[PDB]
Design a protein around this ligand. Structure first.
Ligand code: ZN
Ligand code: ZN
Ligand code: ZN
Lengths: 116, 1199
RNA sequence: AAUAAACA
């Protein structure tokens, strides 16, 4: 099980040190980007982050109750100015447009919400 | 950043096999080869452990052998070997007498960039064939360049025939052979000048062709005599039919041709897939429905060919011949089934060899039955850890209670060897762990001896205290004896058996008693001025050596037998240091029935071997304690402690010389060498062999010969790192450490009533331990192994830690019947309706076994069998978090699996999380307490290709996505994903860093936060890299990313954001490059045995049977050895003329930082005079390097 | 919400 014999839980690697204070992440070019594939910056949640707009990692805001439908396929033009959420929790999806308006749905594995 | 590669297991598994005159012209010898190792096996027929392949010499190359042919040159006394190495290196080698090594005759490097015609990616392997008359030999370099070696110095300069500049525009070669008959070396060459694919036969019907080019050697031209040009499109290998019929058979996938120059084509079809695929005139072979695509073949003297098919089925094709020596019809017979081969050899007439990578490549024996149907029997099988697909570390279940509180982990590995009908699990376990059946606490004694008193049980156990002697009367229950007989009033320096176990002889420092057991016959006092310090023994001969070097001989004589004083005539120019006796039950010590030999080492550096009835000098090394690689006779200085000559192997055949010279073990082989000195001398020499062992922390012996311990004979090498020396009837030398119970002082064979044939030794802390070797492993392989034949392809293995069981994915072959469509509503399944002369495709049905470690049978009522078309892509042991146990994690077995139904059906998948839960067993079946509890089994949205665990999260790979599911009570709730690259086929992770591995594109490292439910891309590789599997090189603070490749490479990546050569933390950078000889799929870490506080050995098992390692090091210890390695690369006579620096290059800059512990192991092999020279040439002493190379051996002695 | 359903 790899954690009885060669355990590494007591090691503070240089890899984990490289990703807390982010170890020299360059302020990203072209300010109309998306910050995609980037997780979060802990400098923004605790205090002031330091750089605004042109920053590598993601800046989150509150009052996002519905996850983004475009974002699942991998097409997020909005990025962090998105009015929708970017998690993977299967409880904050939109209502399905064809179950809410047009009676029943069509496909068998519709992820979107079906409420009555 | 730096590492040392060390190869823990030599690669088992034979890709090439021949039958040539390797040692001399008198006997043929089965030379077989594998990946970067040559083996030469003799043939026994009267063996105790019946026919048996006895190893005679084995040779390691710095390069993978890509073909191998042999030819007896002009006036040669041996048969040279034409090896072929990667990117077109030929190497003609020979065995040499004298030095028992090889000897390179010629080196031919063809790696010129104008010989490629621009094709960088070499896909064709260089293929070596020889003319059966020995006129020339031809290598097909790079597919397009026939390099011809003319023969007669024994050679001629080569030349490179261009293939594409011939007639007929050959352009896609399939096979090439030298044909028989003729007056010139005619070379048949199958090709495909307008190439097609099985799968595209409606516009390209049948395009294979033949040219039999006729090589003019002197004039250097080549007439393209005889061409056929509409052979079936899928022809595999061509084969030259021998002289009395001539011609060629050309294996096609679905047919079989016989072609010749003056005869029309005759070829039959072997199924009804030749209908719309072939316009060649094909008859119908009656009563046969098979295929020939990967089918190895050899020829019986004339008109009989042994085809082993795919599926391991041996067919003996009979070419039915007319009176005019022309082939009229074929004749098959389904002979027996056997190994899934990769080669084939006719040995001595009536023996065949089936060289196989995946399966124990074994020796067969065909006979005639009472037209001429042959029946097969297996005589011997070379043991073969096959292509280890996956391998997992497990804990053995029979560790004895005395070794229980030991601080080191005590574990073994279980290896998914083989494939298909030869598939298996193999239980590899490097050290030896005895079964302590009775322990004792007897302090004060320091040596021990066993004698036999009245089918040969050890009657007494004789201990020697500092002032007294113990007696241990064995039997039903062992007990200390107080009566007369032995001298219990003083110490003993020897106690043994004389005659044939009819008398017991112990050696007091005052004299020697003759004992019939408890009764004494008489006593002979030794009146030497020096006390006796040690002895040695033959069956009638007792040789005493005093402290001052005086030697006397005792000898039995009948009357009742009694010892007689016999003074040896010796010239004492210098004092004798140590002795050894030896006898010849099966002798090569000829000097021209047991012939006794007396060895004798003098303090002036010399070494002397005497025939014992006389005292005449037969062998003499002038400078012995240096450690010279070949001891040739000539008939400060480091001290020689103990010298041992012992015969090992079948019926005490081959001797070995084990000597102890000042904290260094160096042992010798012994081989015949006829030496024209005339006066009567030993016609043998001694070759030193490599080791892994160091002797670094009355006369006490460290070399204790044992016969008949668990069927084995050999030598237990005592000391600070104890080792076993095992030689079976195989004849190969086996060095198995025994790192449990610490250092070992003494040792003895022990055979009792309540104890079986086992042994008996001291702990260092004075603990006498009756012990038995565990009886389930086999100690005849390079590691101790037990082979578990599953008879189905084991894909994965997963040691479930809780309840301690193994979970194996398997697969058996079911003939397919349905073809799934997807027509718009649901799946429709077209039933295969074909002819009765039709072979079916293979559908593989997968099942997950449950193997128990206690006894290695599988567990009934625990076999998760999957759906109809569902294929396991991964099984792992996954630890998911839970609120039941006192910890968080639980340790399940999760398996991913998807349905393969061709490229028209959308492949979907299903995560199969299991759990092994102990229930009450059935009465009578105690294995059946273990049984699966499938928690999760639900179809996903795409194929499940790879699994991982991260802090109790399940990390799965579906499609171009990698999912992060968490295990609730019954459902998986998704938390994170990222749209990753093409096909993620390996993921391992630790401390929320996920390391993926695509098939083509790139590895990635990922990172999972918990407070924000997000998985993200930290760094990927940016270059295309055809990965096999990945690992984690762990340093004290650095984490390296060990990534094996398709091209037999290893390389260590690191995540370095402060470096400027990558982008800012957005591109991985390799920091070590190395070229393993073999493909690698398995990877695991271990703690090694202040330096090495926090570094991990990231081992691996290669896909050719070998097990390697990458031990990390620091910058100083590396560069004290890279100076040595560069001094070792240049100034040494390497095997087959190979360059170890350029072979261990990356084979794409090659930023190499990994040493070679199989080249640095040669520094341990050099004599101590030669050792000091290369130390001075790099600027140090040998003792600094021996403190550097033996500390990379000590910390890597696991398993 | 910016093409979730873009169907023969
Ligand atoms: Zn930020
Ligand atoms: Zn979005
Ligand atoms: Zn819907």
């Amino acid at each position: 099980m790899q954690e009885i014999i060669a355990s590494v839980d007591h090691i503070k690697f240089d890899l984990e040190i490289a990703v807390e204070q982010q170890l020299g992440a360059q302020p990203l070019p072209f300010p109309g980007m998306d910050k995609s594939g980037a997780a979060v910056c802990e400098f923004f949640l605790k205090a002031a982050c330091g750089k605004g707009g042109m920053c590598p990692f993601r800046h989150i805001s509150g009052e996002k109750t519905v996850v983004c439908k475009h974002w699942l396929r991998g097409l997020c033009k909005k990025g962090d100015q998105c009015e929708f959420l970017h998690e993977y929790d299967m409880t904050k999806m939109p209502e399905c447009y064809f179950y809410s308006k047009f009676g029943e749905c069509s496909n068998k594995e519709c992820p979107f919400l079906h409420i009555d | 950043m730096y590492a040392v590669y060390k190869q823990a297991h030599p690669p088992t598994g034979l890709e090439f096999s021949m039958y040539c005159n390797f040692f001399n012209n008198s006997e043929r010898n089965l030379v077989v080869a594998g990946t970067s190792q040559l083996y030469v096996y003799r043939l026994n027929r009267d063996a105790e452990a019946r026919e048996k392949l006895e190893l005679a010499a084995s040779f390691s190359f710095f390069g993978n052998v890509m073909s191998m042919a042999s030819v007896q040159l002009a006036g040669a006394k041996r048969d040279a070997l034409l090896l072929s190495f990667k990117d077109a290196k030929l190497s003609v080698v020979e065995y040499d007498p004298g030095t028992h090594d090889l000897k390179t005759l010629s080196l031919h490097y063809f790696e010129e960039p104008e010989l490629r015609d621009g094709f960088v990616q070499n896909v064709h392997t260089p293929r070596v064939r020889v003319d059966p008359d020995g006129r020339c030999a031809a290598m097909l370099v790079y597919g397009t360049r026939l390099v011809v070696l003319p023969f007669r110095s024994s050679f001629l300069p080569s030349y490179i025939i261009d293939v594409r500049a011939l007639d007929e525009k050959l352009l896609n070669i399939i096979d090439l052979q030298f044909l028989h008959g003729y007056y010139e070396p005619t070379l048949l060459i199958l090709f495909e000048p307008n190439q097609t694919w099985p799968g595209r036969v409606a516009v390209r019907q049948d395009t294979c062709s033949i040219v039999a080019i006729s090589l003019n050697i002197t004039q250097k031209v080549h007439p393209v005599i005889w061409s056929l040009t509409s052979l079936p499109f899928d022809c595999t290998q061509a084969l030259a039919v021998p002289k009395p019929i001539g011609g060629v058979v050309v294996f096609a996938v679905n047919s079989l041709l016989y072609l010749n120059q003056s005869v029309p084509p005759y070829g039959v079809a072997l199924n009804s897939l030749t209908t719309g695929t072939t316009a060649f005139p094909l008859r119908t072979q009656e009563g046969v429905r098979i295929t020939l695509d990967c089918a190895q073949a050899t020829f019986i003297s004339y008109d009989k060919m042994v085809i082993s098919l795919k599926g391991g089925e041996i067919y003996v094709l009979t070419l039915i011949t007319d009176g005019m020596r022309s082939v009229r019809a074929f004749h098959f017979d389904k002979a027996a089934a056997s190994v899934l081969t990769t080669s084939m050899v006719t040995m001595e007439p009536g023996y065949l060899f089936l060289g196989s990578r995946l399966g124990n490549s074994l020796l067969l024996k065909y006979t005639e039955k009472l037209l001429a149907t042959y029946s097969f029997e297996v005589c011997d099988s070379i043991l073969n850890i096959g292509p280890c697909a996956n391998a997992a570390v497990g804990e053995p279940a029979f560790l004895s209670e005395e070794f229980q509180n030991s601080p080191e982990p005590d574990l073994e590995i279980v290896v998914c060897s083989g494939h298909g009908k030869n598939g298996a699990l193999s239980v590899l376990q490097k050290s030896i762990r005895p079964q302590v059946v009775t322990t004792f606490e007897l302090p004060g004694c320091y040596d021990m001896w066993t004698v036999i008193a009245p089918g040969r049980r050890h009657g007494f156990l004789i201990l020697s205290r500092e002032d007294s002697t113990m007696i241990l009367q064995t039997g039903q229950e062992i007990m200390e004896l107080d009566t007369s007989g032995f001298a219990t009033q003083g110490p003993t320096v020897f106690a043994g058996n004389i005659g044939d176990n009819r008398y017991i002889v112990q050696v007091s420092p005052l004299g020697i008693r003759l004992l019939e057991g408890v009764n004494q016959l008489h006593f002979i006092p030794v009146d030497l001025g020096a006390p006796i310090v040690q002895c040695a023994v033959a069956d009638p001969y007792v040789v005493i050596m005093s402290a001052e070097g005086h030697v006397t001989m005792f000898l039995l004589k009948s009357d009742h037998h009694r010892l007689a004083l016999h003074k040896p005539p010796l010239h004492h120019q210098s004092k004798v240091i140590t002795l050894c006796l030896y006898r010849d039950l099966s002798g090569m010590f000829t000097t021209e029935e047991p012939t006794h030999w007396c060895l004798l080492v003098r303090e002036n550096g010399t070494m002397e071997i005497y025939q014992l009835p006389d005292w005449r000098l037969v062998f003499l090394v002038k400078n012995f304690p240096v450690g010279q690689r070949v001891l040739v006779d000539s008939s400060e200085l480091p001290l020689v402690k103990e010298v041992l000559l012992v015969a090992l192997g079948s019926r005490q055949s081959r001797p070995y010389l084990l000597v102890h010279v000042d904290q260094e073990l160096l042992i010798y082989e012994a081989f015949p060498h006829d030496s024209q000195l005339g006066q009567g001398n030993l016609k043998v020499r001694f070759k030193k062999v490599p080791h892994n062992i160091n002797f670094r922390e009355g006369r006490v012996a460290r070399f204790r010969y044992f016969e008949d311990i668990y069927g084995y004979s050999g030598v237990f090498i005592c000391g600070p790192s104890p080792h076993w020396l095992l030689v079976t009837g195989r004849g190969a030398l086996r060095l198995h450490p025994m790192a449990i119970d610490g250092p070992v002082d003494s040792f003895a064979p022990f055979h009792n009533v309540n104890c079986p044939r086992g042994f008996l030794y001291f702990n260092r802390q004075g603990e006498l331990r009756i012990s038995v070797l565990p009886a389930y492993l086999s100690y005849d392989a390079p590691w101790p192994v037990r082979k578990i034949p599953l008879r189905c392809t084991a894909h994965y293995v997963a040691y479930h830690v809780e309840s301690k069981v193994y979970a194996v994915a398997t697969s058996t072959n079911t003939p397919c019947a349905r073809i799934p469509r997807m027509t718009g509503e649901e799946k429709e399944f077209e039933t295969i309706e074909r002819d009765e002369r039709y072979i079916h495709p293979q559908q593989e049905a997968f099942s997950i076994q449950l193997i128990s470690p206690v006894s290695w049978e599988a567990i009934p009522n625990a076999r998760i069998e999957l759906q109809e078309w569902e294929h396991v892509t991964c099984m792992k042991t996954v630890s998911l978090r839970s609120e039941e146990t006192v910890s968080g994690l639980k340790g399940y077995v999760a398996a991913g699996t998807c349905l393969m139904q061709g490229e028209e059906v959308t492949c979907r998948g299903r995560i199969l999380i299991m759990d092994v839960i102990e229930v009450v067993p059935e009465p009578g079946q105690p294995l059946t307490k273990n049984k699966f509890k499938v928690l999760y089994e639900k179809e996903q949205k795409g194929p499940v290709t790879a699994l991982c665990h991260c802090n109790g999260h399940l990390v799965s790979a579906i499609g171009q996505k990698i999912f992060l599911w968490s295990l609730r009570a019954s459902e998986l709730t998704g938390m994170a994903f990222i749209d990753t690259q093409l096909y993620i086929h390996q993921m391992i992770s630790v401390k929320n860093f996920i390391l993926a591995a695509d098939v083509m594109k790139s590895i990635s490292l990922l990172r999972y936060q918990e407070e924000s439910k997000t998985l993200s891309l930290v760094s990927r590789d940016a270059k295309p890299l055809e990965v096999y599997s990945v690992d984690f090189m762990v340093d004290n603070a650095q984490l390296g990313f060990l990534v094996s490749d398709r091209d037999r490479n290893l390389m260590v990546y690191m995540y370095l954001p402060e470096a400027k050569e990558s982008f800012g933390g957005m591109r991985l950078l390799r920091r070590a490059d190395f070229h393993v000889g073999a493909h690698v799929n398995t990877f695991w870490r271990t703690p090694c045995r202040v330096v090495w506080e926090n570094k991990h050995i990231t081992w691996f098992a290669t896909l050719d049977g070998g097990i390697g390692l990458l031990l990390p090091m620091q910058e100083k210890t590396y560069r004290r050895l890279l100076m040595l390695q560069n001094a070792l690369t240049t100034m040494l006579p390497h095997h087959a003329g190979l360059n170890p620096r350029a072979f261990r290059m990356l084979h794409v800059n090659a930023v190499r930082n990994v040493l070679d512990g199989e080249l640095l192991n040669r520094y341990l092999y050099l004599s101590t005079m030669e050792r000091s020279e290369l130390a001075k040439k790099i600027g140090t002493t040998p003792d600094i390097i021996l403190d550097d190379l033996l500390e990379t051996d000590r910390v890597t002695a696991h398993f």
